[PDB]
């Protein structure tokens, strides 16, 4: 339990140095095809410049983007966020495409998490349906966290990762609650079931009152993947990340 | 009729969709998803300046072949 704080250091670090133009547009990138470590700062701002001048200029892309600046430090909606840390989770010398990853889609959660070895390190990628909404569950060598970012637009209210990371990023999730929250029978479950396992699981200040369950999707499919990792690669590509300047 | 629409990222990042002027927005969203991974939800899809009505189709925004959608995946 001195691997909690190294896990917690590691995402520190990493959140921290996405103040840095170059470590933001590298974490953030939506190249999957190829390796997280392999992304150059500098390509990817010459393809953004080419997107600009395609377009007419900043202000005018400005406008067509609805106000978005491709050259701003951005922080990510669920999926992207969802898409890119588990790259650098689970990356080492193979490109990782979580955009073609087989899903689950009759098998429960619980009956998916006994079947791991309790020896590995996973990484569990959540596309949820009913709440229309991606995160990750980290299951590190049974421990579970939570990352994740969300736009705003459904059940949960918006959430920046650096600021989810920091409050929540390090604090276990009951496995008990997850599987409950991950069962097919969750959309049947009582309104305040369904908003305390929201609040317990998803929200920033583990608040029932800030769950809009009206906005979940009844008829929602539930979908994961899981996926070993070794610590120690997601350390070495968090300090790439991290060590862009 | 069938029509080649772009969808570009922020990073510049393009994407090809073959559709047809009925199809749904939410539609186009969910072959986005295919694609890239994004939830619909969690998508904030442009053209002309302004987000697209989920119930509404492309032809109802005036899209054509070559048009170009853009998808924005910051807050």
């Known amino acids: 339990k001195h691997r909690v704080t190294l896990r917690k250091a590691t995402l520190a670090s990493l959140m921290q140095s996405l103040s840095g133009e170059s470590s933001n547009r590298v974490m953030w990138n939506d190249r999957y095809d190829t390796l997280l470590i392999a992304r150059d700062p500098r390509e990817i701002k010459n393809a953004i410049e080419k997107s600009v001048t395609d377009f007419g200029g900043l202000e005018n892309y400005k406008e067509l983007t609805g106000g978005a600046d491709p050259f701003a430090l951005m922080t990510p909606v669920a999926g992207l966020s969802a898409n890119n840390i588990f790259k650098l989770m689970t990356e080492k010398d193979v490109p990782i495409d979580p955009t073609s990853i087989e899903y689950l889609e009759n098998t429960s959660f619980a009956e998916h998490v006994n079947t791991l070895d309790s020896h590995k390190n996973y990484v569990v990628i959540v596309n949820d349906g009913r709440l229309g909404h991606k995160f990750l569950i980290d299951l590190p060598a049974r421990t579970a966290y939570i990352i994740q970012s969300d736009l705003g637009g459904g059940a949960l209210p918006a959430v920046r990762v650096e600021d989810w990371i920091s409050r929540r990023g390090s604090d276990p999730v009951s496995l008990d609650e997850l599987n409950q929250l991950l069962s097919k029978d969750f959309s049947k479950m009582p309104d305040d079931v369904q908003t305390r396992l929201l609040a317990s699981i998803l929200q920033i200040d583990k608040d029932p009152h800030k769950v809009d369950i009206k906005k979940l999707h009844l008829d929602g499919k539930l979908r994961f993947a899981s996926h070993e990792y070794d610590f120690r690669q997601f350390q070495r590509n968090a300090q790439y990340v991290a060590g862009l300047g | ?75």
Request: charged share 35%; proline share 4%; no cysteine.
């Open chain 2, 1 to 75: 009729a069938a029509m080649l629409i772009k969808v570009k990222t922020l990073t510049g990042k393009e994407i090809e969709i073959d559709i047809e002027p009925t199809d749904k927005v939410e539609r186009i969203k969910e072959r986005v998803e295919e694609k890239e991974g994004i939830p619909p939800q969690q998508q904030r899809l442009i053209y002309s300046g302004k987000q697209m009505n989920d119930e509404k189709t492309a032809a109802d925004y005036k899209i054509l072949g070559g048009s170009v959608l853009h998808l924005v995946l910051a807050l």
